[PDB]
Write an enzyme that holds these catalytic residues in place. Sequence first.
Site, PDB file in Angstrom:
ATOM      1  N   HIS A   9       0.332  -0.991   0.267  1.00 45.71           N
ATOM      2  CA  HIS A   9       0.238  -0.031  -0.157  1.00 45.71           C
ATOM      3  C   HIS A   9       0.599   1.360  -0.041  1.00 45.71           C
ATOM      4  O   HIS A   9       1.324   1.914   0.482  1.00 45.71           O
ATOM      5  CB  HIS A   9      -0.773  -0.045   0.961  1.00 45.71           C
ATOM      6  CG  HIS A   9      -2.313   0.075   1.166  1.00 45.71           C
ATOM      7  ND1 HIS A   9      -1.948   1.830   1.895  1.00 45.71           N
ATOM      8  CD2 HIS A   9      -3.056   1.245   0.516  1.00 45.71           C
ATOM      9  CE1 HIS A   9      -3.139   2.544   1.889  1.00 45.71           C
ATOM     10  NE2 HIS A   9      -3.655   2.121   0.809  1.00 45.71           N
ATOM     11  N   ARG A  10       1.295   1.445  -0.772  1.00 44.78           N
ATOM     12  CA  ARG A  10       2.093   3.084  -1.264  1.00 44.78           C
ATOM     13  C   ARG A  10       3.166   2.793  -1.045  1.00 44.78           C
ATOM     14  O   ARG A  10       3.447   3.701  -0.476  1.00 44.78           O
ATOM     15  CB  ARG A  10       0.671   4.556  -0.793  1.00 44.78           C
ATOM     16  CG  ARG A  10      -0.380   4.354  -0.656  1.00 44.78           C
ATOM     17  CD  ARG A  10      -0.921   5.660   0.243  1.00 44.78           C
ATOM     18  NE  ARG A  10      -1.993   5.477   0.842  1.00 44.78           N
ATOM     19  CZ  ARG A  10      -2.744   5.863   1.556  1.00 44.78           C
ATOM     20  NH1 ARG A  10      -1.847   6.907   2.361  1.00 44.78           N
ATOM     21  NH2 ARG A  10      -3.711   5.743   1.709  1.00 44.78           N
ATOM     22  N   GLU A  36       1.677  -0.712  -5.097  1.00 48.44           N
ATOM     23  CA  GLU A  36       0.212  -0.323  -4.727  1.00 48.44           C
ATOM     24  C   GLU A  36       0.366   1.488  -5.532  1.00 48.44           C
ATOM     25  O   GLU A  36       1.089   1.610  -4.317  1.00 48.44           O
ATOM     26  CB  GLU A  36      -0.917   0.045  -3.694  1.00 48.44           C
ATOM     27  CG  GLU A  36      -2.291  -0.065  -4.072  1.00 48.44           C
ATOM     28  CD  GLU A  36      -2.537   1.656  -3.323  1.00 48.44           C
ATOM     29  OE1 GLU A  36      -1.311   2.192  -2.514  1.00 48.44           O
ATOM     30  OE2 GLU A  36      -3.483   1.794  -3.833  1.00 48.44           O
ATOM     31  N   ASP A  38      -1.382   4.998  -6.119  1.00 51.13           N
ATOM     32  CA  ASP A  38      -2.770   6.046  -6.484  1.00 51.13           C
ATOM     33  C   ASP A  38      -1.835   7.544  -7.496  1.00 51.13           C
ATOM     34  O   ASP A  38      -0.513   7.967  -6.685  1.00 51.13           O
ATOM     35  CB  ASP A  38      -3.197   6.825  -5.314  1.00 51.13           C
ATOM     36  CG  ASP A  38      -2.939   5.840  -4.336  1.00 51.13           C
ATOM     37  OD1 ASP A  38      -3.799   5.048  -4.231  1.00 51.13           O
ATOM     38  OD2 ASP A  38      -2.531   5.899  -3.218  1.00 51.13           O
ATOM     39  N   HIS A  51      -1.591  10.285  -3.251  1.00 50.16           N
ATOM     40  CA  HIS A  51      -2.746   9.610  -2.473  1.00 50.16           C
ATOM     41  C   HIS A  51      -4.049  10.827  -2.644  1.00 50.16           C
ATOM     42  O   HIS A  51      -5.269  10.752  -3.067  1.00 50.16           O
ATOM     43  CB  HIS A  51      -2.718   9.405  -1.236  1.00 50.16           C
ATOM     44  CG  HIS A  51      -3.498   8.904  -0.566  1.00 50.16           C
ATOM     45  ND1 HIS A  51      -5.141   9.636  -0.062  1.00 50.16           N
ATOM     46  CD2 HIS A  51      -4.808   7.439  -1.360  1.00 50.16           C
ATOM     47  CE1 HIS A  51      -6.233   8.493   0.276  1.00 50.16           C
ATOM     48  NE2 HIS A  51      -6.133   7.117   0.094  1.00 50.16           N
ATOM     49  N   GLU A 118      -4.476   2.784  -9.428  1.00 50.10           N
ATOM     50  CA  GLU A 118      -6.140   3.372  -8.766  1.00 50.10           C
ATOM     51  C   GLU A 118      -5.943   4.489  -9.552  1.00 50.10           C
ATOM     52  O   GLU A 118      -5.296   5.365 -10.056  1.00 50.10           O
ATOM     53  CB  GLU A 118      -6.112   4.021  -7.571  1.00 50.10           C
ATOM     54  CG  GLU A 118      -7.604   3.843  -7.166  1.00 50.10           C
ATOM     55  CD  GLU A 118      -7.139   4.245  -5.417  1.00 50.10           C
ATOM     56  OE1 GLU A 118      -6.974   3.358  -4.349  1.00 50.10           O
ATOM     57  OE2 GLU A 118      -8.434   5.109  -4.576  1.00 50.10           O
ATOM     58  N   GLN A 154      -7.815  -0.991 -10.571  1.00 49.65           N
ATOM     59  CA  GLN A 154      -7.986  -0.828  -9.007  1.00 49.65           C
ATOM     60  C   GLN A 154      -8.892   1.040  -9.002  1.00 49.65           C
ATOM     61  O   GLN A 154      -8.968   2.447  -9.409  1.00 49.65           O
ATOM     62  CB  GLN A 154      -7.552  -0.647  -7.621  1.00 49.65           C
ATOM     63  CG  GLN A 154      -6.760   0.189  -7.362  1.00 49.65           C
ATOM     64  CD  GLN A 154      -6.197   0.044  -6.261  1.00 49.65           C
ATOM     65  OE1 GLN A 154      -6.960  -0.306  -5.596  1.00 49.65           O
ATOM     66  NE2 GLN A 154      -5.577   0.728  -5.572  1.00 49.65           N
TER      67      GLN A 154
HETATM   68 MG   LIG Z   1      -5.087   3.210  -2.959  1.00 51.00          MG
END
Ligand SMILES: [Mg+2]
Length: 279
Positions: A9-10, A36, A38, A51, A118, A154
């Site tokens: 995550h990030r 991951e 954003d 993000h 994302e 996503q």
């Molecule tokens: Mg995200």
Amino acid sequence: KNKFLNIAHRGASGHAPEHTFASYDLVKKMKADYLELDIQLTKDGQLIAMHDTAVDRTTNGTGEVRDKTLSEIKSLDAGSWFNKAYPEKAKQEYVGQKVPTLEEIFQKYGRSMKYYIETKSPDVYPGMEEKLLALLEKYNLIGQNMSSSRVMIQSFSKDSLKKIHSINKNIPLVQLLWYYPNENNEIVEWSGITHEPKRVTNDDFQEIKKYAVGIGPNLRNDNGDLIINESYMKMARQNGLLIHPYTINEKPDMRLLMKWGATGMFTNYPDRLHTVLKE
Ligand SMILES: [Mg+2]
């Protein structure tokens, strides 16, 4: 096919500032399967990793990304905030970390890494999906088959996913879900895409399955309370969906989701998850 995905995550954002190379450089090391990301779009049309739509929380600047050129973004310190928030994890190297562009990320790791990217609603950054798909294509990150893909996409926005699914069937898409209690303390899905987790239906999931290979639900609400249950995982699996809960940083929560049948997890600690997978 149902191989367990360790999704950083990030980046390894529990160990280094999110969406910096300091954070991304730890992912391969810590045995994550996916990085991951954003993405936002700058005023001069460049895709960057961040993000929030505003630069405030994670930099020394202020204002919306969309109102800023890539040049202005690049002079910001995207790493010092981490040293301040987490003194016990602080590092001098984190000071001065720049905001990465998506192209730079691709140029550095190429095919040694898989990406979990994302998107936002189509109205937020017009033309973002098409720019993203051209970038992916430039670096040969999209195979011509769905199985050998180096990328999953996503989104909370069903419209964004149906768009991409129309342009290219070969990218696995994941429908993110957000469950929360409303003003009457009734649990609802942000987009209205499913019933509350205790009462989901086949139809809820079959509808998602027309454009997406899986779902990504929040495990807990903002209070810290559990909001999905085993029943819900069982129903999603029986409809042939992958399930990737977020954001799981605690070992006991990792062990619970294994048992409940998650097929991946978003975590800020890919090292902890790898360890739990080895038990
Ligand atoms: Mg995200």
